[PDB]
Amino acid sequence: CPLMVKVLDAVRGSPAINVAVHVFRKAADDTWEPFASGKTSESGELHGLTTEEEFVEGIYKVEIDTKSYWKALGISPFHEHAEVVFTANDSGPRRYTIAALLSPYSYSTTAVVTN
Amino acid sequence: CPLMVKVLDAVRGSPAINVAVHVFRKAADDTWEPFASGKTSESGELHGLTTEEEFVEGIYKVEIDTKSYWKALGISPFHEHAEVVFTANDSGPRRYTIAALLSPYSYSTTAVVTN
Amino acid sequence: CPLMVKVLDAVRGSPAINVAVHVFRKAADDTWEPFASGKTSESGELHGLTTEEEFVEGIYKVEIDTKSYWKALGISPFHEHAEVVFTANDSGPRRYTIAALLSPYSYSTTAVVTN
Amino acid sequence: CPLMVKVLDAVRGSPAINVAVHVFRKAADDTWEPFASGKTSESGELHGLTTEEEFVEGIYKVEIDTKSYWKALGISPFHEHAEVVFTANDSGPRRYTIAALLSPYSYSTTAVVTN
Ligand SMILES: [Mg+2]
Ligand SMILES: [Mg+2]
Ligand SMILES: [Mg+2]
Ligand SMILES: [Mg+2]
Protein backbone atom coordinates (compact mmCIF):
# COMPACT_ATOMS: atom_id res chain seq x y z
CA CYS A 1 0.00 0.00 0.00
CA PRO A 2 2.05 2.96 -1.23
CA LEU A 3 -0.49 5.71 -0.50
CA MET A 4 -2.83 5.79 2.52
CA VAL A 5 -5.05 8.63 3.70
CA LYS A 6 -6.37 8.96 7.27
CA VAL A 7 -8.97 11.57 8.24
CA LEU A 8 -10.07 12.62 11.77
CA ASP A 9 -12.90 14.90 12.98
CA ALA A 10 -11.85 17.41 15.67
CA VAL A 11 -15.45 18.40 16.55
CA ARG A 12 -16.80 14.95 17.36
CA GLY A 13 -13.53 13.25 18.40
CA SER A 14 -13.95 10.51 15.88
CA PRO A 15 -12.60 9.15 12.63
CA ALA A 16 -14.15 11.07 9.66
CA ILE A 17 -16.16 8.22 8.07
CA ASN A 18 -17.25 7.99 4.40
CA VAL A 19 -15.29 11.09 3.37
CA ALA A 20 -14.55 11.25 -0.36
CA VAL A 21 -10.85 11.54 -1.26
CA HIS A 22 -9.71 12.30 -4.84
CA VAL A 23 -6.12 11.95 -5.93
CA PHE A 24 -4.83 13.74 -9.07
CA ARG A 25 -1.41 13.62 -10.73
CA LYS A 26 0.05 16.64 -12.56
CA ALA A 27 0.07 15.96 -16.33
CA ALA A 28 2.71 17.15 -18.89
CA ASP A 29 0.44 20.14 -19.87
CA ASP A 30 0.23 21.32 -16.16
CA THR A 31 -3.42 20.07 -15.82
CA TRP A 32 -4.57 17.79 -12.94
CA GLU A 33 -5.22 14.27 -14.22
CA PRO A 34 -7.47 11.88 -12.18
CA PHE A 35 -5.30 9.21 -10.53
CA ALA A 36 -7.26 7.40 -7.75
CA SER A 37 -10.22 7.98 -5.45
CA GLY A 38 -12.10 6.37 -2.62
CA LYS A 39 -13.97 6.91 0.62
CA THR A 40 -12.63 6.70 4.17
CA SER A 41 -13.72 3.61 6.16
CA GLU A 42 -15.29 3.39 9.67
CA SER A 43 -11.71 3.87 11.03
CA GLY A 44 -11.29 7.08 8.93
CA GLU A 45 -8.72 5.30 6.79
CA LEU A 46 -8.50 4.90 3.05
CA HIS A 47 -6.40 1.91 1.94
CA GLY A 48 -6.08 0.43 -1.55
CA LEU A 49 -6.11 3.76 -3.46
CA THR A 50 -3.36 2.63 -5.75
CA THR A 51 -0.72 -0.01 -6.42
CA GLU A 52 3.09 0.07 -6.60
CA GLU A 53 2.82 -0.38 -10.45
CA GLU A 54 0.50 2.63 -10.89
CA PHE A 55 2.14 4.97 -8.34
CA VAL A 56 4.91 6.58 -10.41
CA GLU A 57 6.95 9.66 -9.60
CA GLY A 58 5.20 12.98 -10.04
CA ILE A 59 3.31 15.81 -8.35
CA TYR A 60 0.14 14.57 -6.64
CA LYS A 61 -2.84 16.40 -5.20
CA VAL A 62 -4.98 14.75 -2.53
CA GLU A 63 -8.39 16.49 -2.31
CA ILE A 64 -10.55 15.66 0.74
CA ASP A 65 -14.27 16.49 0.39
CA THR A 66 -14.63 18.30 3.70
CA LYS A 67 -17.67 20.32 2.44
CA SER A 68 -19.90 17.21 2.05
CA TYR A 69 -18.68 15.83 5.36
CA TRP A 70 -19.66 18.95 7.34
CA LYS A 71 -22.94 19.46 5.40
CA ALA A 72 -24.05 15.89 6.25
CA LEU A 73 -23.39 16.66 9.93
CA GLY A 74 -25.43 19.91 9.67
CA ILE A 75 -22.32 22.01 10.32
CA SER A 76 -21.39 25.17 8.35
CA PRO A 77 -18.15 24.27 6.53
CA PHE A 78 -15.79 27.04 5.69
CA HIS A 79 -13.46 25.00 3.43
CA GLU A 80 -14.64 23.53 0.12
CA HIS A 81 -12.06 20.78 0.48
CA ALA A 82 -8.54 20.18 1.63
CA GLU A 83 -5.90 20.19 -1.26
CA VAL A 84 -2.64 18.45 -0.11
CA VAL A 85 -0.03 18.79 -2.95
CA PHE A 86 3.35 17.05 -2.94
CA THR A 87 6.02 15.48 -5.15
CA ALA A 88 6.14 11.67 -4.70
CA ASN A 89 8.81 9.04 -5.49
CA ASP A 90 11.35 11.56 -6.83
CA SER A 91 14.31 9.68 -5.18
CA GLY A 92 12.75 6.23 -5.66
CA PRO A 93 9.61 4.48 -4.33
CA ARG A 94 8.33 5.49 -0.92
CA ARG A 95 5.19 4.69 1.13
CA TYR A 96 3.12 7.75 2.07
CA THR A 97 0.51 8.26 4.74
CA ILE A 98 -1.38 11.58 4.41
CA ALA A 99 -3.21 12.36 7.67
CA ALA A 100 -5.72 15.19 8.04
CA LEU A 101 -7.50 16.63 11.10
CA LEU A 102 -10.72 18.48 10.28
CA SER A 103 -12.56 21.36 11.94
CA PRO A 104 -15.17 23.61 10.23
CA TYR A 105 -12.74 26.61 9.94
CA SER A 106 -9.42 24.80 10.12
CA TYR A 107 -7.48 21.79 9.01
CA SER A 108 -4.09 20.27 9.76
CA THR A 109 -2.29 17.73 7.63
CA THR A 110 0.91 15.79 7.95
CA ALA A 111 2.72 13.20 5.97
CA VAL A 112 4.53 10.07 7.15
CA VAL A 113 7.03 8.96 4.52
CA THR A 114 8.69 5.52 4.89
CA ASN A 115 11.31 3.85 2.65
CA CYS B 1 -8.73 45.17 4.72
CA PRO B 2 -11.09 42.32 3.86
CA LEU B 3 -8.46 39.58 3.40
CA MET B 4 -5.24 39.19 5.39
CA VAL B 5 -2.81 36.25 5.37
CA LYS B 6 -0.41 35.41 8.21
CA VAL B 7 2.25 32.72 7.96
CA LEU B 8 4.26 31.21 10.88
CA ASP B 9 7.24 28.84 10.98
CA ALA B 10 6.86 25.99 13.56
CA VAL B 11 10.55 24.92 13.31
CA ARG B 12 12.12 28.28 14.19
CA GLY B 13 9.18 29.79 16.15
CA SER B 14 9.13 32.84 13.95
CA PRO B 15 7.02 34.63 11.35
CA ALA B 16 7.59 33.14 7.87
CA ILE B 17 9.13 36.15 6.03
CA ASN B 18 9.07 36.85 2.23
CA VAL B 19 6.77 33.91 1.50
CA ALA B 20 4.86 34.18 -1.81
CA VAL B 21 1.04 34.01 -1.42
CA HIS B 22 -1.30 33.66 -4.42
CA VAL B 23 -5.08 34.05 -4.18
CA PHE B 24 -7.38 32.62 -6.88
CA ARG B 25 -11.16 32.92 -7.34
CA LYS B 26 -13.20 30.13 -8.95
CA ALA B 27 -14.38 31.27 -12.41
CA ALA B 28 -17.72 30.36 -14.13
CA ASP B 29 -15.96 27.53 -16.11
CA ASP B 30 -14.65 25.91 -12.82
CA THR B 31 -11.05 27.14 -13.49
CA TRP B 32 -8.96 29.04 -10.90
CA GLU B 33 -8.44 32.61 -11.92
CA PRO B 34 -5.71 34.83 -10.37
CA PHE B 35 -7.27 37.30 -7.90
CA ALA B 36 -4.50 38.79 -5.70
CA SER B 37 -0.94 38.03 -4.62
CA GLY B 38 1.97 39.30 -2.56
CA LYS B 39 4.79 38.37 -0.21
CA THR B 40 4.65 38.16 3.58
CA SER B 41 6.38 40.97 5.50
CA GLU B 42 8.97 40.76 8.36
CA SER B 43 5.96 40.09 10.69
CA GLY B 44 4.88 37.14 8.44
CA GLU B 45 1.78 39.13 7.45
CA LEU B 46 0.40 40.06 4.08
CA HIS B 47 -1.92 43.11 4.08
CA GLY B 48 -3.54 45.00 1.19
CA LEU B 49 -4.18 41.93 -1.01
CA THR B 50 -7.53 43.25 -2.17
CA THR B 51 -10.22 45.89 -1.62
CA GLU B 52 -13.84 45.74 -0.38
CA GLU B 53 -15.01 46.55 -3.98
CA GLU B 54 -13.06 43.64 -5.53
CA PHE B 55 -13.66 41.04 -2.81
CA VAL B 56 -17.06 39.62 -3.74
CA GLU B 57 -18.70 36.38 -2.53
CA GLY B 58 -17.31 33.30 -4.24
CA ILE B 59 -14.95 30.35 -3.84
CA TYR B 60 -11.35 31.39 -3.15
CA LYS B 61 -8.07 29.48 -2.96
CA VAL B 62 -5.10 30.85 -0.97
CA GLU B 63 -1.84 29.15 -2.06
CA ILE B 64 1.24 29.69 0.08
CA ASP B 65 4.59 28.86 -1.58
CA THR B 66 5.94 26.75 1.31
CA LYS B 67 8.35 24.81 -0.95
CA SER B 68 10.41 27.96 -1.77
CA TYR B 69 10.33 29.05 1.86
CA TRP B 70 11.86 25.78 3.17
CA LYS B 71 14.35 25.52 0.26
CA ALA B 72 15.71 29.03 1.05
CA LEU B 73 16.29 27.91 4.68
CA GLY B 74 18.04 24.73 3.50
CA ILE B 75 15.33 22.46 4.99
CA SER B 76 13.85 19.64 2.80
CA PRO B 77 10.06 20.25 2.43
CA PHE B 78 7.32 17.73 1.72
CA HIS B 79 4.53 19.90 0.28
CA GLU B 80 4.56 22.03 -2.86
CA HIS B 81 2.39 24.60 -1.09
CA ALA B 82 0.09 25.15 1.99
CA GLU B 83 -3.44 26.17 1.28
CA VAL B 84 -7.02 27.02 2.14
CA VAL B 85 -9.99 26.72 -0.30
CA PHE B 86 -13.12 28.38 1.07
CA THR B 87 -16.40 30.01 0.36
CA ALA B 88 -16.64 33.71 1.16
CA ASN B 89 -20.23 34.60 2.15
CA ASP B 90 -21.49 38.09 3.05
CA SER B 91 -23.21 37.63 6.43
CA GLY B 92 -22.88 41.12 7.86
CA PRO B 93 -19.49 42.92 8.16
CA ARG B 94 -16.69 40.39 7.66
CA ARG B 95 -12.91 40.45 7.58
CA TYR B 96 -11.06 37.19 6.75
CA THR B 97 -7.70 36.36 8.26
CA ILE B 98 -6.14 33.17 6.81
CA ALA B 99 -3.38 31.91 9.11
CA ALA B 100 -1.01 29.09 8.26
CA LEU B 101 1.47 27.29 10.53
CA LEU B 102 4.28 25.58 8.64
CA SER B 103 6.53 22.57 9.35
CA PRO B 104 8.58 20.67 6.71
CA TYR B 105 6.11 17.73 6.62
CA SER B 106 2.97 19.39 7.93
CA TYR B 107 0.85 22.47 7.89
CA SER B 108 -2.25 23.79 9.66
CA THR B 109 -4.49 26.50 8.24
CA THR B 110 -7.35 28.35 9.96
CA ALA B 111 -9.63 31.16 9.09
CA VAL B 112 -10.64 33.87 11.51
CA VAL B 113 -13.76 35.70 10.37
CA THR B 114 -14.48 38.93 12.30
CA ASN B 115 -16.90 41.82 12.44
CA CYS C 1 4.89 43.33 26.10
CA PRO C 2 7.06 40.24 26.58
CA LEU C 3 4.25 37.65 26.69
CA MET C 4 1.02 37.73 24.67
CA VAL C 5 -1.59 34.97 24.33
CA LYS C 6 -4.03 34.67 21.41
CA VAL C 7 -6.86 32.14 21.32
CA LEU C 8 -8.95 31.16 18.24
CA ASP C 9 -12.08 29.02 17.84
CA ALA C 10 -11.87 26.51 14.91
CA VAL C 11 -15.63 25.66 15.04
CA ARG C 12 -16.97 29.20 14.60
CA GLY C 13 -13.93 30.75 12.84
CA SER C 14 -13.70 33.49 15.42
CA PRO C 15 -11.49 34.78 18.23
CA ALA C 16 -12.16 32.89 21.49
CA ILE C 17 -13.51 35.73 23.71
CA ASN C 18 -13.42 35.92 27.57
CA VAL C 19 -11.33 32.77 27.90
CA ALA C 20 -9.41 32.48 31.21
CA VAL C 21 -5.61 32.12 30.78
CA HIS C 22 -3.31 31.23 33.70
CA VAL C 23 0.49 31.40 33.50
CA PHE C 24 2.68 29.49 35.98
CA ARG C 25 6.47 29.48 36.46
CA LYS C 26 8.32 26.39 37.68
CA ALA C 27 9.56 26.98 41.26
CA ALA C 28 12.82 25.65 42.84
CA ASP C 29 10.87 22.70 44.43
CA ASP C 30 9.47 21.61 40.96
CA THR C 31 5.96 22.97 41.81
CA TRP C 32 4.00 25.33 39.49
CA GLU C 33 3.72 28.76 40.98
CA PRO C 34 1.14 31.33 39.74
CA PHE C 35 2.87 33.99 37.60
CA ALA C 36 0.21 35.94 35.62
CA SER C 37 -3.39 35.56 34.47
CA GLY C 38 -6.21 37.27 32.61
CA LYS C 39 -9.06 36.83 30.17
CA THR C 40 -8.93 37.11 26.38
CA SER C 41 -10.46 40.25 24.85
CA GLU C 42 -13.05 40.58 21.99
CA SER C 43 -10.08 40.03 19.59
CA GLY C 44 -9.20 36.75 21.43
CA GLU C 45 -5.98 38.39 22.66
CA LEU C 46 -4.56 38.78 26.11
CA HIS C 47 -2.05 41.65 26.50
CA GLY C 48 -0.32 43.04 29.61
CA LEU C 49 0.11 39.67 31.39
CA THR C 50 3.53 40.61 32.70
CA THR C 51 6.40 43.12 32.47
CA GLU C 52 10.00 42.90 31.21
CA GLU C 53 11.20 43.15 34.88
CA GLU C 54 9.06 40.20 36.05
CA PHE C 55 9.51 37.95 33.01
CA VAL C 56 12.80 36.20 33.74
CA GLU C 57 14.23 33.05 32.11
CA GLY C 58 12.64 29.86 33.41
CA ILE C 59 10.10 27.15 32.64
CA TYR C 60 6.58 28.50 32.10
CA LYS C 61 3.18 26.85 31.68
CA VAL C 62 0.31 28.66 29.90
CA GLU C 63 -3.06 27.04 30.77
CA ILE C 64 -6.08 28.06 28.73
CA ASP C 65 -9.49 27.24 30.28
CA THR C 66 -10.96 25.61 27.15
CA LYS C 67 -13.50 23.55 29.15
CA SER C 68 -15.35 26.70 30.38
CA TYR C 69 -15.19 28.24 26.92
CA TRP C 70 -16.92 25.28 25.20
CA LYS C 71 -19.43 24.80 28.07
CA ALA C 72 -20.56 28.46 27.74
CA LEU C 73 -21.19 27.86 24.01
CA GLY C 74 -23.15 24.68 24.77
CA ILE C 75 -20.59 22.45 22.99
CA SER C 76 -19.30 19.28 24.78
CA PRO C 77 -15.49 19.59 25.21
CA PHE C 78 -12.92 16.82 25.58
CA HIS C 79 -10.00 18.61 27.28
CA GLU C 80 -9.91 20.31 30.67
CA HIS C 81 -7.57 22.94 29.24
CA ALA C 82 -5.22 23.73 26.24
CA GLU C 83 -1.63 24.43 27.06
CA VAL C 84 2.00 25.14 26.31
CA VAL C 85 4.93 24.34 28.67
CA PHE C 86 8.17 25.95 27.53
CA THR C 87 11.54 27.27 28.42
CA ALA C 88 12.02 31.02 28.11
CA ASN C 89 15.67 31.79 27.24
CA ASP C 90 17.15 35.28 26.79
CA SER C 91 18.86 35.15 23.36
CA GLY C 92 18.76 38.82 22.41
CA PRO C 93 15.49 40.86 22.36
CA ARG C 94 12.54 38.46 22.54
CA ARG C 95 8.76 38.76 22.64
CA TYR C 96 6.70 35.55 23.05
CA THR C 97 3.31 35.14 21.46
CA ILE C 98 1.53 31.89 22.48
CA ALA C 99 -1.29 31.13 20.05
CA ALA C 100 -3.85 28.38 20.53
CA LEU C 101 -6.42 27.05 18.06
CA LEU C 102 -9.35 25.30 19.73
CA SER C 103 -11.78 22.56 18.64
CA PRO C 104 -13.97 20.47 21.02
CA TYR C 105 -11.69 17.39 20.72
CA SER C 106 -8.45 18.99 19.62
CA TYR C 107 -6.13 21.90 20.05
CA SER C 108 -2.94 23.24 18.46
CA THR C 109 -0.54 25.59 20.20
CA THR C 110 2.44 27.46 18.73
CA ALA C 111 4.90 29.98 19.94
CA VAL C 112 6.09 32.91 17.90
CA VAL C 113 9.32 34.37 19.25
CA THR C 114 10.25 37.77 17.75
CA ASN C 115 12.85 40.49 17.99
CA CYS D 1 -6.77 -1.41 24.95
CA PRO D 2 -8.62 1.49 26.56
CA LEU D 3 -5.91 4.14 26.19
CA MET D 4 -3.56 4.46 23.19
CA VAL D 5 -1.16 7.28 22.38
CA LYS D 6 0.20 7.99 18.88
CA VAL D 7 2.97 10.53 18.25
CA LEU D 8 4.15 11.95 14.87
CA ASP D 9 7.12 14.18 13.96
CA ALA D 10 6.25 17.09 11.62
CA VAL D 11 9.92 17.95 10.86
CA ARG D 12 11.04 14.55 9.61
CA GLY D 13 7.67 13.22 8.37
CA SER D 14 7.90 10.16 10.51
CA PRO D 15 6.46 8.47 13.56
CA ALA D 16 8.11 9.88 16.75
CA ILE D 17 9.93 6.73 17.95
CA ASN D 18 10.98 5.95 21.55
CA VAL D 19 9.22 9.01 22.98
CA ALA D 20 8.48 8.73 26.71
CA VAL D 21 4.81 9.14 27.65
CA HIS D 22 3.70 9.50 31.30
CA VAL D 23 0.09 9.24 32.36
CA PHE D 24 -1.10 10.70 35.71
CA ARG D 25 -4.52 10.57 37.35
CA LYS D 26 -5.79 13.42 39.56
CA ALA D 27 -5.88 12.25 43.22
CA ALA D 28 -8.44 13.28 45.92
CA ASP D 29 -5.98 15.96 47.27
CA ASP D 30 -5.68 17.60 43.74
CA THR D 31 -2.13 16.16 43.23
CA TRP D 32 -1.11 14.21 40.08
CA GLU D 33 -0.69 10.52 40.88
CA PRO D 34 1.40 8.28 38.53
CA PHE D 35 -0.93 5.99 36.56
CA ALA D 36 0.93 4.43 33.56
CA SER D 37 3.93 5.12 31.34
CA GLY D 38 5.71 3.76 28.32
CA LYS D 39 7.63 4.60 25.18
CA THR D 40 6.28 4.95 21.63
CA SER D 41 7.18 2.08 19.25
CA GLU D 42 8.75 2.21 15.73
CA SER D 43 5.21 3.10 14.46
CA GLY D 44 5.00 6.03 16.97
CA GLU D 45 2.30 4.15 18.87
CA LEU D 46 2.05 3.28 22.52
CA HIS D 47 -0.25 0.32 23.25
CA GLY D 48 -0.68 -1.58 26.52
CA LEU D 49 -0.44 1.46 28.84
CA THR D 50 -3.27 0.22 30.98
CA THR D 51 -6.08 -2.30 31.30
CA GLU D 52 -9.87 -2.00 31.51
CA GLU D 53 -9.65 -2.97 35.27
CA GLU D 54 -7.15 -0.20 36.08
CA PHE D 55 -8.62 2.56 33.87
CA VAL D 56 -11.29 4.06 36.15
CA GLU D 57 -13.11 7.35 35.75
CA GLY D 58 -11.16 10.46 36.61
CA ILE D 59 -9.08 13.36 35.30
CA TYR D 60 -5.99 12.15 33.42
CA LYS D 61 -2.90 13.96 32.22
CA VAL D 62 -0.85 12.53 29.36
CA GLU D 63 2.67 14.06 29.34
CA ILE D 64 4.78 13.50 26.21
CA ASP D 65 8.54 14.03 26.65
CA THR D 66 9.04 16.23 23.60
CA LYS D 67 12.19 17.87 25.09
CA SER D 68 14.22 14.60 25.07
CA TYR D 69 12.92 13.75 21.61
CA TRP D 70 14.11 17.02 20.05
CA LYS D 71 17.41 17.06 22.03
CA ALA D 72 18.29 13.56 20.71
CA LEU D 73 17.70 14.85 17.17
CA GLY D 74 19.94 17.90 17.84
CA ILE D 75 16.98 20.26 17.48
CA SER D 76 16.25 23.19 19.85
CA PRO D 77 12.94 22.28 21.56
CA PHE D 78 10.76 25.06 22.76
CA HIS D 79 8.29 22.90 24.74
CA GLU D 80 9.37 20.93 27.83
CA HIS D 81 6.62 18.43 27.12
CA ALA D 82 3.06 18.21 25.91
CA GLU D 83 0.42 18.02 28.80
CA VAL D 84 -2.94 16.66 27.45
CA VAL D 85 -5.54 16.79 30.31
CA PHE D 86 -9.02 15.29 30.09
CA THR D 87 -11.80 13.62 32.09
CA ALA D 88 -12.16 9.92 31.15
CA ASN D 89 -15.00 7.39 31.60
CA ASP D 90 -17.38 9.87 33.27
CA SER D 91 -20.44 8.42 31.40
CA GLY D 92 -19.11 4.84 31.42
CA PRO D 93 -16.08 3.08 29.86
CA ARG D 94 -14.73 4.44 26.61
CA ARG D 95 -11.63 3.71 24.46
CA TYR D 96 -9.37 6.72 23.91
CA THR D 97 -6.72 7.41 21.32
CA ILE D 98 -4.62 10.53 22.08
CA ALA D 99 -2.73 11.61 18.94
CA ALA D 100 -0.04 14.29 18.93
CA LEU D 101 1.84 16.00 16.07
CA LEU D 102 5.17 17.52 17.11
CA SER D 103 7.20 20.47 15.83
CA PRO D 104 9.95 22.30 17.81
CA TYR D 105 7.71 25.38 18.50
CA SER D 106 4.28 23.84 18.10
CA TYR D 107 2.15 20.84 18.82
CA SER D 108 -1.33 19.65 17.89
CA THR D 109 -3.30 16.98 19.68
CA THR D 110 -6.62 15.31 19.12
CA ALA D 111 -8.60 12.60 20.75
CA VAL D 112 -10.60 9.78 19.19
CA VAL D 113 -13.18 8.49 21.66
CA THR D 114 -15.05 5.25 20.85
CA ASN D 115 -17.79 3.47 22.87
MG1 LIG E 1 13.27 11.74 -10.16
MG1 LIG F 1 -24.75 35.12 -1.15
MG1 LIG G 1 20.20 31.59 30.55
MG1 LIG H 1 -19.29 9.74 36.60
Numbering used by the authors:
A (entry chain A), B (entry chain B), C (entry chain B), D (entry chain A): 10 to 124
Sentences from the paper on this structure:
Transthyretin (TTR)3 is a 55-kDa protein that aggregates into amyloid fibrils under pathological conditions.
Senile systemic amyloidosis is a late onset disease in which wild-type (WT) TTR aggregates, weakening the heart muscle. T4 binds in a hydrophobic pocket at the center of the tetramer. We analyzed the solvent-accessible surface area of TTR and found that β-strand F is indeed more exposed in the TTR monomer than in the dimer or tetramer. A second region was also more exposed in the monomer: β-strand H. We therefore tested whether β-strand H might also be a driver of TTR aggregation. We found that the inhibitors did not affect WT TTR stability or compete with T4 for its binding site. Several other studies propose that TTR aggregation occurs by dimer arrangement (19–21). 4 and Fig. 3A), impeding self-association.
